[PDB]
Amino acid sequence: HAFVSTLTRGDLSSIRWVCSGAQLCTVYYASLNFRDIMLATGKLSPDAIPDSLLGMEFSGRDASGKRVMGLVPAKGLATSVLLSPDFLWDVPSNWTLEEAASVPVVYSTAYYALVVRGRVRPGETLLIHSGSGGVGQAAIAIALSLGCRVFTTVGSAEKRAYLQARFPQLDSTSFANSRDTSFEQHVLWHTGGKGVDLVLNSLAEEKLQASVRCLATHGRFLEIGMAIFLKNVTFHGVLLDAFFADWREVWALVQAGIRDGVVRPLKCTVFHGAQVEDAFRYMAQGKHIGKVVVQVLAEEPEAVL
């Protein structure tokens, strides 16, 4: 057994492996999430987390050899994990373990935000900021699966092209800029001045204010961790890791989304286990689209082993 640790407080360059009804699983792939970077740099305190707390997401095999993926409150960046079966899903036959490790966090977050909290209804109109981000992509897949009208902001033309390739249902009018507030005029015009029913937000300061102005009356503002009253707006603070009966709803939504073809893996950037430091450094640069994953163990050709 080994786990990943920051040997020097706050220094990403010091990231190293250290040898040292619950289900015991062998980890094949462990993904990096934003929280991991915040923990490693000391920007987030371990006390804020509900030895090393790195890693909340993995794919691998259970003791029967079955391919699984899951969420853990901590210690996912390790060679094995022990977790509640309430936080495990079967990996579909059409997925690699590599890509299965990109799924649990972003789709659990997106289903919780859109369905459980936002109560999105078929045909409603959404603004999903930073659509090429992990949670944004998952939210777009879900919204489209419900026949919603989707608007999304992207940080570059390349990110737009990426979303166009991933989601053929998106047309040119689906896209606006995440790097300014021009998405406001865009969304107002294409909704006839009515605005959107839901905003999924990760932006700041002036872009946040512009997002509030984008809401229709009774609009819901989903934040992933005068007008407000005139428009009877609702604001949701959303933090997935707090879950570590509502959760079982999220689990069921993810599972159904997997079976129904809604849940699709992200594109991954893969690092061998010995390059875990590089993986963290890379993740922190934020120049990729999709998931950064660490290959702890290579997947075998066998389906069950």
Which tokens belong to 140? 């777009």
- Measured from the CB of residue 53, what is the shortest distance to Na ion in angstroms? 10
Pair 262, 285: CB distance under 8 Å: no
Q: Annotate each residue in 87-126 with x if it binds a second copy (CB under 8 A) or - if it does not, as one string.
A: ------------------------------x---------
Nearest Cα to Cα of residue 113 among 16, 202, 7, 40: 202
Q: Annotate each residue in 213-232 with x if it binds a second copy (CB under 8 A) or - if it does not, as one string.
A: ----xx----x-xx-xxxxx
Nearest Cα to Cα of residue 185 among 151, 219, 154, 140: 151
Amino acid code (one letter) for 279 = A
Could you say which DSSP state residue 298 is in? P
Angle at 38 between CA 36 and CA 42, to 5 degrees: 115
Q: Is 92 in the site for Cl ion (CB under 5 A)?
A: no
Among residues 18, 121, 235, 274, the one that binds a second copy under rule CB under 8 A: 235
Looking at beta carbons only, is 78 or 150 nearer to Na ion? Answer: 78
Q: 44-103: which residues touch Na ion (CB under 5 A)?
A: 55-57
Cross-strand pairs, 92: none
Q: 33-92: which residues touch a second copy (CB under 8 A)?
A: 48, 50
Task: Give the CA dihedral 136, 105, 108, 155, nearest 10 degrees.
Answer: 0
- The residue whose Cβ lies closest to Cl ion is 132
50 contacts which partner out of Cl ion, a second copy, Na ion, none, CB within 5 to 8 A by kind?
a second copy
Q: What are the φ/ψ torsions at residue 228 (nearest 5 degrees)?
A: -55, -35
55 contacts which partner out of Na ion, Cl ion, a second copy, none, CB within 5 to 8 A by kind?
Na ion
Q: In Å, how far are 36, 42, 61, 122 from 10, measured between CA atoms?
A: 12, 5, 32, 45
Among residues 33, 59, 108, 153, the one that binds Na ion under rule CB under 5 A: 33
**By the criterion CB under 5 A, which residues form the site for Na ion?**
33, 36, 55-57
Write out the binding residues for NADP(+): 126-143
**By the criterion CB under 8 A, which residues form the site for a second copy?**
48, 50, 117, 217-218, 223, 225-226, 228-239, 242, 246
